[PDB]
Symmetry: C3
Subunit: 276 residues, 3 copies
């Protein structure tokens, strides 16, 4: 509640460390935490089968909530943690419950980089569904009412795009974190554009802030899954109106476009973790 949180963090670390003590023949000290958001659902298959990876369900780790698992293993030669299943503020969870896995994993003392992906709506007018955005700055709107993105890791991400011959666009710009769970209205998207937003999403920024608070480097990659509707709605005086449902955002579209970009995103992250 006030200090039970710290005991909960210590308790979860005791569990994870003791499980890493039984599973791995040698000391497993992960250097990267990969929050497998959109586009990273299948990167767990890129974990090496040997040494056999350790899979911890959230139900057994103290403090970890559900409504999820931790994967400890080697990817591209480097030891990493993948957390499949993330908590969101719009689901009712508190900010502490959302970033509790990061604070527990930080007690291992070996992780020094957070790599996180998420879906995002395109606010920048030149953005198209299917593009990626490397985040170099953010606006925390919920934090407003109650850099941080490592330059070398961003340089590294673009070098791996060239090395892998990935044709997919990867922009640079600002990511606005909003609470959700509603998609933005037309006037809200226009406001976000005026505020300097390039893409908008409802996750990631709280984990980034906690990761920076723990001294970790951060690399954040947004998947532009849709282009936010910005045009004013059809006037009642228009005899030939554009239907107000045309181009509406949809979770099915977010899911489909996340999966379409997953092969490129997983290849980029797999190449990056070898040089963390």
């Amino acid at each position: 509640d006030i200090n039970e949180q710290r005991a909960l963090i210590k308790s979860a670390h005791r569990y994870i460390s003791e499980k890493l003590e039984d599973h791995f023949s040698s000391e497993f000290l992960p250097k990267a935490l990969v929050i497998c958001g959109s586009g990273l659902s299948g990167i767990s298959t890129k974990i090496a089968d040997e040494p056999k990876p350790l899979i911890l369900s959230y139900s057994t780790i103290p403090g970890f909530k559900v409504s999820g698992e931790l994967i400890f293993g080697y990817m591209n030669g480097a030891p990493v943690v993948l957390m499949n299943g993330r908590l969101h503020s719009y689901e009712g969870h508190s900010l502490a419950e959302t970033v509790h896995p990061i604070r527990a994993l930080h007690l291992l003392g070996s992780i020094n980089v957070l790599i996180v992906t998420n879906a995002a709506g395109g606010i920048n007018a030149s953005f198209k569904a299917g593009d990626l955005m490397c985040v170099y700055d953010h606006i925390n709107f919920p934090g407003l009412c109650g850099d941080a993105y490592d330059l070398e890791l961003r340089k590294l991400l673009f070098s791996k795009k060239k090395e892998l011959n990935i044709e997919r666009k990867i922009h640079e710009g600002t990511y606005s974190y909003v609470h959700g769970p509603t998609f933005e209205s037309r006037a809200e998207s226009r406001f976000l554009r005026l505020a300097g937003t390039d893409a908008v999403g409802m996750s990631t920024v709280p984990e980034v802030v906690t990761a920076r608070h723990c001294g970790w480097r951060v690399l954040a990659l947004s998947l532009i899954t849709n282009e936010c509707v910005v045009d004013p709605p059809a006037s009642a005086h228009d005899e030939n109106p554009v239907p107000i449902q045309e181009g509406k955002a949809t979770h099915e579209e977010v899911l489909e476009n996340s999966a379409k970009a997953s092969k490129d995103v997983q290849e980029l992250i797999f190449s990056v973790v070898a040089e963390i």
Copy 2:
């Protein structure tokens, strides 16, 4: 927490359903819920006298909370009147504010929400006494965590992720202007963006200026949480704002101005809001009375 507003919603649904069952000879399936905000306090007198309308006090409905539900026929159509609404600046949560919408949704007949409210004019072309038909909104508190859908999703009502670019039905807005011409109403009816702020303070000049550049046409203290909840239930929405005052947006008098305009000039007041809402009430009454017959 999801399991106990579900229990509260279903409990409130039966209490309304059972007393709709005893009161009306023919079963009462209302087409619309009319939130009687500013300009609609008197529309209860437009309810047809037969069949006998049913009035349910909030104090006797589980989960609810001045305040009553009026079940009757208006211009031939069965409706529910929300006479008295909960505001968030009074300390109530958003879940308590929109709980009547979810409970009334279980009647399975309502597919349109008609809601009015008072609003300060941010658009410079707006005058006190004008009306604004809402076709878009800015939910700035929702962007920052003050959202009526926060928490576990009511999967039986709507999707976890809800679009709002289609929030304000076009056919209902055209029907509203069609009734303005039919009734020969000369009052101005604009079409613009409504911004929901928490209150209970009136906006400072810098807050009104910020809302203006953000794209606001009129700023109010209610409605948007109910519109979002109704849209989550799949309802069509017709929102109508009453421009009760013109927001002070010019920067305040500077200390080095030797011909300063008094900073207290044109300040907003609750009495001006009340009196302008009353003056426009007859027009708003007539408009909603005609619209309900064609929803």
Copy 3:
């Protein structure tokens, strides 16, 4: 809940009023409450030694969470509080004395206007209550009707005459430190894009204080004079692209010292 909040306000005033009676020979009716922000707490040295000032720790005042200083400075009786319903409970408690008419609040603020430098002063003549627009508001809940209105205007929050007074006192005191007139944006919890957004919204200085106290004082009918100390210029320019190769406290002290004598 308001019933218990009302009793705690009365208890705090009943304690404060009783202590003023025992301490001061002549009855003490303070005319201004001066809130001393961080780094600007040394203003307590500007209170006259005679009559003897009264210092009440917050821990001794019922309902409070720092110290309250009751004394005379420049001949005027004032209250100094050295250091959301909790934050403004002291304002409503002190209002029950029936004498305070002015709130003078000072704070440290980050510079959003590009023309500001660290060390500059800014006289607040407008604010943006971001938390209040979203739900974190000092007046949320049942209204204190005995204190003020359910709906309060904020377009007349920063008294013009009190601002004209401050500027007059700077010329008199030959203070050369620049004093700007601008908007203070209140944020509860910045990035370059966040600082850029504030500038686009009309922010001249940003911080996490002042505004809730200003609203509560305005709800009580007080006049408000707000002064900000620019401690740093918030960076606004975007970060590098992956493709490229303390003396002001005495100045504030002199200003408040000269202002309180002619409020």
